[PDB]
């Protein structure tokens, strides 16, 4: 069977080749560089967030950009005020070495997880004077990598089990799971309307899934290896990608083809995180050479460079309206670019 | 206006002073990592020194993404038991790692018996500091010292010079007496002392 099945699998791939090559009737390079640029925009270190015993690994913006949560690797989970840098809560954790943290859009629960293979949610209503544990979403066979809150009842989790899963807070079980990845999935991104989501495993195979049906819808490829961070367009019709290929790519959800490639010759460091701007023209990405770089998605040029850290950036994020940018690195500091 | 600012500043200092209550406690716990719930943890104090050793064997076999999170551990514990070639190949990648530069690795051994896969040690020189007290026949002398020099040959051919390896023989006391040397190299290199 495999002698013929692998041949039909390859023959179908050529059908994908002529499909994507048929849509190559025009190039986006000419359309993007036939307009006016914007140039450098001034960005200053407005605030620095000290008070961490170890390095951070991920963040998540609050409900109305007033607050933001950061997860330290020692085990502390801190909630900060963007305006006055005041600590709100300092909830400890059952174990250390976390790798993800999610903030609910309603501001009622906060999730976090790491190598423990257990996703824990924490109620934010201070009854006992502090935060207490609410529910533990165990059951996975590998470490969790990314989590995103759809509502106060649903939450998706990216884990090393090579299979995404949708969870319900009412009982805490895998109501719907996705399959078809090669290698442990590392990051996922939720659409703003919470009607779609995409993920990427350690094969540069960005595959689209349905939030209401456990089946694959689309597949994206073109990165050399080890896709690391994905983020959707402000509207949801496209999404950029960040991989260890030291170059960012932009994919759309209509033509199903690689739109643009953001590469440079003077970089030998891989990408770790990527985030969009409110307008979508600016693409922010954290590098591994101790500095940050923002890319003009409509120009494929290094519009600006952000520095100040001496370690790798492991997380990014922008406000709910494109007001400020939060960049966290392994320096244990959380610098709010604005 | 001062009603909300003073209350917010009160919770702020009440949390900032809480981090001081466990900052020194955190630094006093020298984390450890052991290589071959999703993670196993053991705790033990040796002469007023805390040690939180973790076992990560319960995770995925692939070690491409979760090993990068361990840049904070002060010492990695490695063990051995053709799996012998793969164990050395893994040691090479850990040594030549881009980020794993400040985590000195410890190498242990175990009882074993392997001679047919490496026909080169048939001409290997005799050990210079052999320990024949347990009655070691020339088989185990050349064998143990050959795999010993193989790991040492890796740790001298490459590297920038900011981390070293420390083999041992056949416990916990042998690790504490070696972890002290790692801390000594840390507090001494900071002062530009060669």
């Amino acid at each position, epitope marked *: 069977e495999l002698d013929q099945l692998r041949q039909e699998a390859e023959q179908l791939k050529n059908q994908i080749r002529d499909a994507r090559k048929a849509c190559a009737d025009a190039t986006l390079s000419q359309i993007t560089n036939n307009i006016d640029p914007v140039g450098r925009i001034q960005m200053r270190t407005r605030r620095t967030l000290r008070g961490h015993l170890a390095k951070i690994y991920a963040m998540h913006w609050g409900t109305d950009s007033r607050l933001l949560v950061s997860a330290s690797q020692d085990g502390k989970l801190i909630i900060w005020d963007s305006y006055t840098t005041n600590k709100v809560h300092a909830i400890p954790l059952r174990s250390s070495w976390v790798m993800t943290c999610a903030y609910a859009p309603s501001g009622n629960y906060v999730a976090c997880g790491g190598l423990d293979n257990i996703c824990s949610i924490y109620n934010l209503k201070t009854r006992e004077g502090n935060v207490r544990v609410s529910r533990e979403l165990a059951g996975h066979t590998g470490y969790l990598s990314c989590c995103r809150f759809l509502d106060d009842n649903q939450i998706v989790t990216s884990s090393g089990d090579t299979t995404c899963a949708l969870w319900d807070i009412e009982t805490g079980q895998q109501t719907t799971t996705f399959t078809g990845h090669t290698g442990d999935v590392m990051s996922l991104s939720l659409a703003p309307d919470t009607r779609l989501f995409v993920s990427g495993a350690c094969d540069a195979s960005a595959k689209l899934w349905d939030v209401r049906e456990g089946m694959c819808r689309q597949t994206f490829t073109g990165h050399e290896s080890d896709i690391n961070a994905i983020c959707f367009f402000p509207n949801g019709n496209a999404f950029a990608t960040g991989s260890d290929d030291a170059t960012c790519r932009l994919f759309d959800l209509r033509a199903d083809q690689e739109l643009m490639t953001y590469s440079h010759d003077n970089i030998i460091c891989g990408i770790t995180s990527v985030s969009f701007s409110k307008s979508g023209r600016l693409l922010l990405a954290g590098y591994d050479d101790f500095n940050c770089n923002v890319w003009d998605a409509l120009k494929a040029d290094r519009a600006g460079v952000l520095a100040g850290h001496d370690n790798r950036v492991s997380c990014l994020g922008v406000t709910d309206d494109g007001m400020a940018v939060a960049t966290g690195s392994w320096d244990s500091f959380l610098k709010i670019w604005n | 206006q001062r009603n909300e600012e003073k209350a917010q500043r009160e919770a702020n200092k009440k949390i900032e002073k809480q981090l001081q209550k466990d900052k020194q406690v955190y630094r006093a716990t020298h984390r450890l990592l052991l290589l071959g719930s999703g993670i196993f943890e053991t705790k033990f104090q040796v002469d007023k020194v805390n040690f939180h050793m973790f076992d990560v064997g319960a995770q995925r076999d692939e070690r491409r993404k979760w090993i990068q999170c361990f840049n904070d551990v002060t010492a990695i514990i490695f063990v051995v038991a053709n799996r012998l070639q*793969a164990a050395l190949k893994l040691f090479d990648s850990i040594w030549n790692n881009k980020w794993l530069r400040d985590t000195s690795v410890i190498l242990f051994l175990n009882k074993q018996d392997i001679e047919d896969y490496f026909p080169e040690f048939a001409r290997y020189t005799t050990p210079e500091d052999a320990t024949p007290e347990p009655g070691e026949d020339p088989r185990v002398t050349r064998a143990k010292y050959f795999i010993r020099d193989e790991f040492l040959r890796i740790s001298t051919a490459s590297g920038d010079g900011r981390h070293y390896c420390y083999p041992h023989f056949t416990n916990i006391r042998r690790v504490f007496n070696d972890c002290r040397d790692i801390i000594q190299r840390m507090h001494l290199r900071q002062y530009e002392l060669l």
Partner: nanobody
Amino acid sequence: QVQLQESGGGLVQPGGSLRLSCAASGFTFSNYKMNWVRQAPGKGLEWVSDISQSGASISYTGSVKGRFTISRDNAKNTLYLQMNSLKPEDTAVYYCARCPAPFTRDCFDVTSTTYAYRGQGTQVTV
């Protein structure tokens, strides 16, 4: 789409010679190292050979050292592994392998199960 296509193999008399080939496609060969993994019947995956991206520092294992040679060509992104004196223990399925993080010298567990950066591979017998 990245794909690893191998060639060469078949039943040959013991002590013969063969030149296995690995055709890289979909990725830049000038920035990545290469490795070779064999698999005995009823056994796991074992790394047997490798090569650097600069065309130097070639290394092998004690079981294939001397009688096994690996070659590369940046002008065509091809890979060639030639050997001689085929032993009965060498009868195994070979797979062309590559590891991520280009322009680096570190990559872990290339012989791990469920690995996608590995071609369909070929087999040889005595």
